[PDB]
Amino acid sequence: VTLCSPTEDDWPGMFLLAAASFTDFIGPESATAWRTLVPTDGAVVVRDGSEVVGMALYMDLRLTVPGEVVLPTAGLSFVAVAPTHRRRGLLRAMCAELHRRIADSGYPVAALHASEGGIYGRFGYGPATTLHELTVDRRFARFHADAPGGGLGGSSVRLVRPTEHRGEFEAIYERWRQQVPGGLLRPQVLWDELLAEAKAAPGGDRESFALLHPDGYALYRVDRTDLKLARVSELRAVTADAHCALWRALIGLDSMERISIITHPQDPLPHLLTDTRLARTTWRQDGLWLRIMNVPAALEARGYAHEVGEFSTVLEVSDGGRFALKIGDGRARCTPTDAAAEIEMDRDVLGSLYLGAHRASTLAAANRLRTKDSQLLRRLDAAFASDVPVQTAFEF
Amino acid sequence: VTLCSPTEDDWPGMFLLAAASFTDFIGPESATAWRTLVPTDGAVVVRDGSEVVGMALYMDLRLTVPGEVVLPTAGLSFVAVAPTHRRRGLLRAMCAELHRRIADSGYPVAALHASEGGIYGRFGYGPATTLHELTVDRRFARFHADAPGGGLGGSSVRLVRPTEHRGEFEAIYERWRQQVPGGLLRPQVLWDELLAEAKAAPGGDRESFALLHPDGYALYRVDRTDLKLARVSELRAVTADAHCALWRALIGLDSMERISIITHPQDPLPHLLTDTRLARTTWRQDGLWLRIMNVPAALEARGYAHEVGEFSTVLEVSDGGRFALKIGDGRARCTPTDAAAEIEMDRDVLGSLYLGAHRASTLAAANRLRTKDSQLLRRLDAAFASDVPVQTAFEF
Amino acid sequence: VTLCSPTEDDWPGMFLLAAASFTDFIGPESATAWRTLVPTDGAVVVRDGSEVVGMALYMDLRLTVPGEVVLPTAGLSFVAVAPTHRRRGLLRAMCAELHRRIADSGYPVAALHASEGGIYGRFGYGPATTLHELTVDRRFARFHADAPGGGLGGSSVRLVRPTEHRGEFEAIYERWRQQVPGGLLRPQVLWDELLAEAKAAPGGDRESFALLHPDGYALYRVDRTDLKLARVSELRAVTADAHCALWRALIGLDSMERISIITHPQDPLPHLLTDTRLARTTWRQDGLWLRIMNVPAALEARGYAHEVGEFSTVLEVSDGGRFALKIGDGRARCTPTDAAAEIEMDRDVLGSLYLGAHRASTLAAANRLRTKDSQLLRRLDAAFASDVPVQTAFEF
Amino acid sequence: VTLCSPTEDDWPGMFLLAAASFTDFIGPESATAWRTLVPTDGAVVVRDGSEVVGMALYMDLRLTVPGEVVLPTAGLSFVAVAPTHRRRGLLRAMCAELHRRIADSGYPVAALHASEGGIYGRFGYGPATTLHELTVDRRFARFHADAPGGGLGGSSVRLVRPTEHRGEFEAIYERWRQQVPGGLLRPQVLWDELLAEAKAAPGGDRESFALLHPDGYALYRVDRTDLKLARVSELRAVTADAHCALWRALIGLDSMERISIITHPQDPLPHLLTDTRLARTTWRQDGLWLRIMNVPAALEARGYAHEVGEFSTVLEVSDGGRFALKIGDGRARCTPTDAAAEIEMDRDVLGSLYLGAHRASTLAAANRLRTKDSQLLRRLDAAFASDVPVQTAFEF
């Protein structure tokens, strides 16, 4: 059992383990595009000796955090352990090697999407975004008198074929991802993959349509089996007007009984309707997970709420140092100290606070972060809150 | 079609309309207890002429709002319109009469639980608490190393018969309701009803058990049909330790596959587990709805977040006045003005902000409140936030 | 194995066989009321020797046929064969004895409700009414501009407790049953049973309500498990206005998603709505079955359509005689003949034609009645049609 | 927003709107065949300005009505409104333009299949045929002793590959469509489409088989997911013997538990079995909708029942003229008059009467047609009845 960077000769063993580990992995063409995002030395394999029994890698991503700050981010992906090689510490060894490489390379954060909720907390990843599925019974849906774009005259929204408006989608998404915490840069090769998945599949997904506004798009397809359900795969709106105009068009899908979307907890959709209850939360789950690799670099990089007055404290991360933390005028300074800790928490907890998806008060009540000062808790809650609701860009 | 306060002679017609309108209304004994909470002149009936074709009433309640302030609250309840008398403006007429009586009597707020989401917004009620159902697959549930009360030795929690510990439940609930926004005083007659519903029913609900801690209780019963589901009807914990100790005991129900509870969005339960995902959000809905009857009395009564610096603005409520609003040191002053409005919203929107369940930013993005100042929005969001998460006491 | 009229001593053995044969038979009190309708000599039992292994009986009923003619009718009921005594010709022997007694007593017709569709055709019973279940999604239901009773002002319909308006229900039903083919006289003891079943049952059916109009009533109850379904057990309307007024009230049950009723194929309900499709046929089945005991007495008793000109033919019933049949001015004369048959059919087929539920043309296409004259077929179709749609009164 | 006949350049915008509006529309090849049936000027588009936001067209069809009379019929089809352009009166404008063109061209009737039941009544279309799904549990099915073709010896029915017997299917269907009200001429291009859909589809429908008799065929395929269900897509029988012989063969599909077919309410199938109840009505819905474009041309074209004696009345269609209507010897004369109306109804109601699927008495009880004469009602019922049951040919 060696742990090595793979050679070109290891990739067929990796594609077999991938096919056996992930139902979405059709074959080598499935990894082509993603693989242009893996740097040299971004991948490890475990061999028996020899055949591939374990693999993991990271992609070079750009993640938007509160204050519209974009961080270089190591996106852990393609992590699999052969069903023959369970319980042999292979995931631990692969994550320790990649974390060493990611830290040495200068990434301040790593990120992933978790197949299960119980695996990555012990490696320092905290869930940092929340997926919220809304299902609208569009047959009862009426827009509130206050809702934007109720005026008579031309619609600002067009129904279009996705592949014919790639430039517009790219430009709208680039604006969206730079203004929203959770935003990811989407490289050309991932736009190629997204547009390929928009075509009908022989006995698979139905054809995707787009609704296009100058300041937003929705990409939607009818469910393969439930022919009265439209699933909105993606909806990116840069203005409130674009968001409302797109939902007026989706609620105009008169063939459908139900429109479903995976969105975030602060989606204003329900408030656009005379009956907020028509926007049923049908599913909730963790989205993006974060591991803070460098505590001071990460805490100083993000912007903080201007509404909390200057304060200083001492934060200890369980295996990640102790720091004098001063937050004022929306900026943090975070410097080494041996002064007594006023706040303690594990690395994963800081990841869960970092984008504003989880309140410090909520984690304190679970004893995941410890402090004897209730005032300090309220100040942390207020300071780490994000003005712009955190959203989830796209899985990887 | 007259609208009158009912006489003793009207109540049998009211019990018939009740039985036909609400599946939970077994008969007159169903209204006995609740009815001690209806003041003189708290009830209206509509007669055809004569028989009862419409009814509505309010109960005298005490509602806890942020800052642990308790307001006299008119709880609208028993609102029904005969299926023969639909679309005749009877609900509008009954709500206008009760609102006149409630305002003249000096209540600063009214409240209700809505049978449907599309009815009460137009009468000025906004949804103000959020019910969140969590279903735990307790067979996988393990407590995080950080979770309180993991030590060996005696359990602080006892399994008890509800009717034998009424005094302890009352005392714990009284402490809970005074510290949590959404808390309601629960009078003796509602404790009598709650303890009666704890007994097994011939071909109905199974027997209720209690888990009792010095600082919390849970009341739970196995589902009538799904014998592997335990439903926690109520869980009131005054400390984090009590909340964790009670959940350790509920996860010790080894007969069960699943524990379900109707809780609030900030329930720390998920964070107590090594897998946060085991705490599935299976259902979300509006809980308590508020109508602000007197804008200045309500805005001055509640406490505001100390973390936002002093600010002044001009708020117009659509049919509810215009006010100079100054918020600093956790207190608001709210005085008449004809100065230009900086913020506008309908009455229902203010009700939805009032307990901190909905952010001003979220309602602004839906255009339910209008302002041209993004700084003012962030300040409102921060000021109206509740330190203690808003919860739902009990339906009425 | 003797076949005898039962003595008082046989009835406990009969109640045991009943309880084991019919899930609805709670105990002796279940047969008390019905049993006042069984004449002396209306019952047979088969004993092993001794214990009751077979039973059958008939009740004295009054059945309305086209032309508003009321016939004395033998209602076969309480027919059971012990599961130990299957395939021993016991049903055949019991039906031959009762048919002899019914014929000798002077009944022109027998009738029953069939537990299964494959049993009674061979004993000469044809299905003669059609049960049609309509389920309305009342949330979309809007009344057509043409629909009666759309005017503003008092409703002619009242919501009432069934037991307090027994006199009105009785009078409306008596008018209904005399004007509709399929109508049955409902004696006092069956009104006692109907009103008893209207009360809530400990872990059984929910309480029944009534909607009362001067010229119609509906009796409805919410489903025991599906709390958004109202089931209309009975709806008797003497005028079109009463039928429309009652459906406006049922569609005013705003708590409900769906209203279901067992009605007949010509129920005008769908045509009252702007969307006829909201009235989904969810179930169809045979209702009342008829055996014509005396062919000439039955054919001369009913009225025929005035719109077909006088015609004469020769009808042979397979074991029931050959007859010169002359139909004109809405009356038939039906006299013995040995002239060549122009129409042939079995006894059950005549029962299926007799109330107008089945067309002669439809039965001819299945070869259940044979004729070489297509003109004679059209004339029979037209003559046996019922002006007033055939309905089903109540099961027995 | 212009409304224009489309140019060749408009058809790609029309195919996109089609793909987004109808799940069955795979792509341009889906409209090729149908489109040979659209005359010059048979199509309208609505453009924003430009892109296609609305479309509708009619095909040249031949519809059989009672008396075996074949009418030129405008079949409205391909009607779609972009989800972005809802509630802008686009369907009303398109239907008014096509109705003007259809009337000017000399069609006496228009027809369509409705996506929803609440849309087309207001444009004068009444539902005129009734789809009736029968599901047979073929494991219990036994043919009645009376049923044709029970004799020993060769079967008159063969199991065949559809594509190898196109000539026989065409000839049988041509005979069927000329003798049955609801029959449509099926042009060569629709036989090409039907035979293409008979082949297995990669992850779609299973292969179709045929059962072939000299005087009838059935085309059936096993359900894609329920492998014990055979769905009969089409069954066309010119004689009762052919209908019975085909059902004996379908009930010989010993692999299957259930045979389902979409048929008409007078299908004799149930009467062929010893248990009529084995033929469960599992679904009922409107089929073909009719708009009478020229009242006198339509009323004079169809044949009427010979069994009703000569009568005269005055019929007013709400926006369609008033007429002296005389019906005798199976023929109507229908001439302009200003004499007082004895019968009134909207245009859609006449469409619903026209093929005999709905009785005048049933529509009168819903107040959809008004008369003060009950004798006149019975005469209309009898006169508009169809000797041959109305059936549905094929959707368009």
Ligand SMILES: Clc1cccc(COc2ccccc2CNCc2cccnc2)c1
């Ligand atoms: Cl060489 C390489 C590098 C990074 C990612 C991959 C592709 O991983 C796939 C591809 C298809 C299905 C499943 C997976 C693995 N699950 C995560 C994931 C990734 C991408 C899209 N959706 C989900 C290949």
Ligand SMILES: Clc1cccc(COc2ccccc2CNCc2cccnc2)c1
């Ligand atoms: Cl005289 C009076 C005054 C106020 C409330 C009542 C009782 O109302 C009932 C009782 C039982 C079932 C349903 C309802 C009405 N739905 C609201 C509600 C109320 C109480 C408990 N759960 C739900 C009677």
Ligand SMILES: Clc1cccc(COc2ccccc2CNCc2cccnc2)c1
């Ligand atoms: Cl002594 C006698 C005479 C005639 C009928 C009876 C009662 O028969 C019952 C009673 C309850 C349940 C089931 C049955 C039998 N199924 C037919 C039926 C009858 C009445 C009401 N619903 C259904 C008893």
Ligand SMILES: Clc1cccc(COc2ccccc2CNCc2cccnc2)c1
């Ligand atoms: Cl250019 C033109 C003219 C007339 C009809 C069409 C095709 O319309 C299609 C084709 C496939 C699926 C759905 C539709 C529209 N729904 C009605 C329909 C029509 C034909 C077959 N089944 C249903 C194209």
